[PDB]
């Protein structure tokens, strides 16, 4: 027989063409998975099973795929096993399982719940038991090395691109808590910023529009706040409005999940917006995508939202991907006005997160 079925193959397309769509498959959440696609032509390249409500990220060096999920000996009964798994990016094969205490966050795929330090040495994840804390996983040693309980009352992880192993979290007091890790993964020091926003009067979405040394956040009411960490202490400021009087008269407000993005080279910030906003519409699909110049604080463009809910930006290639839950839209954002290149239909059944393979 000339033809013989073989396995052990690598992803057919180069790494720079790949994107990862985290499909929660909410209708059957125990079978969530990551779908790998070629954004240049929309070809399905492969997938990684992630059991119950998996979360995913690609290693900074782009060699491995990190997943986080929960298992039970008998799925709906039996002992619980929360873990981080390491998979080879090219072969999409399981390589290593890292044990986690049974409290990793089980929830929708916001970027800030499963991240890694800038130097790629540690995986930083959110815990909820429901009491909150941040977990630290040493990649090299493949071990959970720290439980940042000082983050109790805070939520999500925001890595500081200008430091090797530091990250911030948003806390219930409306401020930011910064954590600096030692070379071993344990907390070396921490600092608290002054209040940035009013939790009760102007809550912000947790999704940051992250620059090299500062982060921008949008609020339920269309305001923009900032956290500058270029120095020792974090300096907070804001708000300034994304809306003019006409926008307000029509009740335009932000809406989505991973709803904002920052094109660092130009300072342009992208946000999903919808009209007729009111209490309870902060997760509404985008009616439009607004492009803001963070320097001049002016809106420079507004285009059809295609019902998008989440987005992600590729700095080098000047690309923006939007996701409406099942379809992925690819945009060229080299110019102020985004340009739609193509739409990948049926990329997932229920995804709120898509990511580019690091390049």
């Amino acid at each position: 027989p000339r033809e013989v079925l073989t396995g052990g193959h690598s992803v057919s397309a180069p790494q720079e063409n790949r994107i990862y769509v985290m499909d929660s498959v909410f209708m059957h959440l125990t079978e969530s998975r990551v779908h790998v696609y070629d954004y240049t032509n929309g070809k399905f390249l492969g997938m990684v099973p992630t059991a119950f409500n998996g979360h995913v990220q690609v290693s900074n060096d782009g060699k491995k795929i990190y997943t986080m999920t929960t298992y039970h000996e008998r799925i709906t009964r039996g002992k619980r096993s929360d873990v981080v798994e390491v998979w080879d990016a090219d072969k999409l094969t399981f390589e290593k399982e890292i044990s986690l205490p049974p409290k990793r966050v089980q929830g929708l795929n916001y970027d800030g719940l499963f991240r890694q330090t800038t130097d790629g040495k540690f995986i930083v994840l959110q815990n909820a038991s429901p009491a909150t804390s941040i977990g630290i996983v040493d990649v090299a040693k493949g071990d959970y090395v720290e439980d940042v309980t000082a983050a109790a009352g805070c939520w999500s992880v925001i890595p500081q691109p200008n430091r090797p192993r530091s990250f911030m979290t948003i806390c219930g007091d409306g401020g930011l808590l910064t954590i600096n890790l030692g070379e071993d993964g344990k907390v070396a020091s921490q600092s608290r910023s002054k209040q940035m926003f009013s939790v009760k009067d102007d809550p912000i979405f947790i999704a940051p529009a992250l620059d090299k040394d500062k982060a921008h956040f949008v609020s339920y009411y269309g305001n923009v706040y900032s956290a500058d960490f270029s120095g020792d202490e974090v300096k907070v400021d804001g708000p300034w409005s994304l809306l003019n009087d006409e926008d307000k008269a029509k009740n335009w407000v932000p809406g989505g999940y991973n709803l904002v993005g920052l094109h660092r080279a130009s300072g342009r910030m992208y946000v999903f917006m919808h009209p007729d906003g009111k209490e309870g519409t902060h997760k509404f699909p985008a009616a439009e995508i607004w492009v803001m110049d963070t320097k001049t604080k002016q809106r420079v463009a507004r285009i059809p939202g295609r019902d998008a809910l989440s987005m992600t930006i590729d700095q080098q290639r000047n690309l923006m991907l939007t996701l409406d839950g099942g379809n992925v839209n690819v945009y060229d954002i080299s110019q102020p006005e985004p340009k739609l290149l193509r739409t990948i239909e049926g990329a997932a059944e229920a995804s709120l997160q898509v990511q580019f393979h690091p390049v």
């Binding site: 038991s129 009491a131 109790a152 009352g153 806390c171 007091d173």
Partner: protein
Amino acid sequence: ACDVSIEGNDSMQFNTKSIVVDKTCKEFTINLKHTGKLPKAAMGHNVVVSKKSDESAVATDGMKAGLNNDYVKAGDERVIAHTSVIGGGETDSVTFDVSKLKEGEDYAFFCSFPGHWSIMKGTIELGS
């Protein structure tokens, strides 16, 4: 007499929404019992007495104080009295002189454990 036993469960609830102290009492004693089974690290409870207005502020600083400080800023002048954070199946106690009740103002007891003061809060008062 001058004794009151309050409870807290795994559902973030107190079995009382208001405590009344008898004027005759010179010093009052409050007893907290965690009737749940979740560890203090996951679902702990405590009782913090403070002027109705200081509640939120106290709870906020208490959150920054951490668990090692029973989620209450050390030496906090806004706190009349507070118990230690207990876990499921645990109990604590606190006794404070009643000779410090701002006449005309309201006092409230709540749990400073991160995010719990939301529901776990009540009204403590003097007299009848």
